[PDB]
Write a protein that binds this DNA or RNA. Structure first.
Ligand SMILES: [Mg+2]
Ligand SMILES: [Mg+2]
Ligand SMILES: [Mg+2]
Ligand SMILES: [Mg+2]
Ligand SMILES: [Mg+2]
Length: 112
RNA sequence: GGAGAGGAGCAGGCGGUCGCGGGGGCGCACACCUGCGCUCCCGAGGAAAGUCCGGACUCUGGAGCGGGGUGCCGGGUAACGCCCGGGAGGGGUGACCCUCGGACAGGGCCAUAGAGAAGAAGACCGCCCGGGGGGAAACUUCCGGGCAAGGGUGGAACGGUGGGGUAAGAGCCCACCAGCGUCGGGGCAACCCGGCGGCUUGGCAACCCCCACCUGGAGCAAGGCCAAGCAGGGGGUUGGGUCGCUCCCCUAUUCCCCCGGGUUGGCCGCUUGAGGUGUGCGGUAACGCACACCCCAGAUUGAUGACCGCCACAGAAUCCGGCUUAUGCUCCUCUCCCGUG
RNA sequence: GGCCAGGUAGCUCAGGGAGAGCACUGGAUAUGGGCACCCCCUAAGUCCAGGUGUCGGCGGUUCGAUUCCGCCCCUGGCCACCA
């Protein structure tokens, strides 16, 4: 859903500068009110996370978590998900349910 | 069965619940442009990779030189540094694998060790001949002369080993070998086979080079179009005109260089191509030709996931031809070895 | 996606027969200290002695490669339109 996909080239700077942030050991989540009746997701994966296979797997998991849980995630925010060094350190050791739990714990705390 | 060499295919599938990307069809709104909404088709790789080569395709005004690349020979191809076939040299018992022009066109470099390393250089331990001297003799000692044959030194010592010939010795002569010069035969050829013959005189060209062939430079962030928006200023014996050098077609600010500020939107390029698959024919083969069938990702923060159930390596970003590296199996050949019918 | 650089003692940096600087380990000795000297402890410093490496890895050429010729690994940078 590309209507659900927020542009990063223009908006990342604005969200970084004007928005809020939440984090845990695996993710940093940046967010800002978008003035819409729905939320939009963006993913920023640092080059150092790895090659296409690895980065694309992470992005797919994140997109899926967001899509399936859209109903419970707060509405009216532009959201940027950033994986942390730790995650890229035990990514192969971290299962899907753990990534889901850790990401949702942050997403559900987006206020207000 | 064991050990090993060559090579070909696949990339966990099929049946279920949801979620994407591009086309098509439809539901509709269309006073234009176009704007949404919901089923059929297709949807990452053998390496998509590293960016090591070769193109195709774009933009830079001409030519020459320099520079760079390839290196036995013959084909194949759009082309190549690739592939196929064949010839020498080497390794392995063997199937097989690895190597590749020229050092009497020239210049330069060979440390250390060693008597001596490019004109034929050299006498260290030594070998033999002719005298003077000492000494009973063995042996020593001085002068003159003859050796590259033994040993030592090396990565290599100016042909190798065996015999004859020598005072003692050398292709001095002879044998087989290696090299070179020729004559004759067979190959398009690289080169092979046989005969004759003085006796022959380092290595490195992944150092410059010589010979033969090939070659501008950038790269899809190439380049073309539209929309949006701020803010211009300082320079040019001229400089710049897609690497350098030298001759040459220009252009004078509108061009180029430096500093500063505006976008950091959308469309084209963007996928049908030296393109796959199935035969038939030619060719030792790589591969070519002929007909038929197919349309096989075109994203732009970048599309393939999760749960269930019987059994790796890693993700297109302009696209092809190859190389190299990373990696899980399965099958087909051939070689050697132990054991049996 | 493409185009370039660089990898050298622990760190910064030189350059076809492996070096400087910071630096580390010792010995010397207080004008520091147990008290005030004797005796002894500790070295910020100052003397001196050195300690030391797959040349980023793996192969080839060569008698020998930091230098030459190939691949692989790691660390950085550059590109688009407007005027
Ligand atoms: Mg059996
Ligand atoms: Mg690539
Ligand atoms: Mg890459
Ligand atoms: Mg000799
Ligand atoms: Mg440009």
């Amino acid at each position: 859903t590309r209507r659900e996909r927020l542009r990063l080239r223009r908006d990342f700077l604005l969200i970084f500068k004007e928005g809020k942030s939440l984090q845990n050991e695996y993710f940093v989540v940046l967010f800002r009110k978008n003035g819409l009746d729905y939320s939009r997701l963006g993913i920023v994966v640092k080059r150092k996370f790895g090659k296409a296979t690895r980065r694309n797997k992470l992005k797919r998991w994140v997109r899926e978590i967001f899509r399936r849980n859209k109903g419970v995630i707060p509405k009216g925010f532009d959201i940027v998900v950033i994986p942390r060094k730790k995650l890229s350190e035990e990514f192969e050791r971290v299962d899907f349910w753990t990534v889901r739990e850790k990401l949702l714990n942050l997403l559900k705390r987006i206020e207000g």
